[PDB]
């Protein structure tokens, strides 16, 4: 006796990275909520030098 409105199982179809998931594309992930990815803490190496003895 009530009009049918979408529920969570319906809404989750549009939560994916792509509308049609594909074997390869199922491993794509949605972008972050803000467009900010985790900072890639890349180890920028410090040059090591021998100063002396000679």
């Amino acid at each position: 006796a009530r009009q049918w409105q979408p529920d969570v199982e319906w809404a989750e179809q549009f939560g994916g990275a792509v509308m049609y998931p594909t074997k390869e594309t199922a491993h794509w992930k949605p972008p972050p909520w803000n467009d900010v990815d985790p900072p890639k803490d890349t180890l920028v190496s410090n040059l090591t030098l021998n100063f002396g003895p000679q």
Binding site: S45, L47, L49, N50, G52, P53
Partner: peptide, 16 residues
């Protein structure tokens, strides 16, 4: 040559 001791890393590493 690095003053008598063997170099630690490479001289082809990023130099800021």
């Amino acid at each position: 040559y690095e003053c008598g001791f063997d170099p630690m890393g490479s001289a082809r590493l990023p130099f800021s």
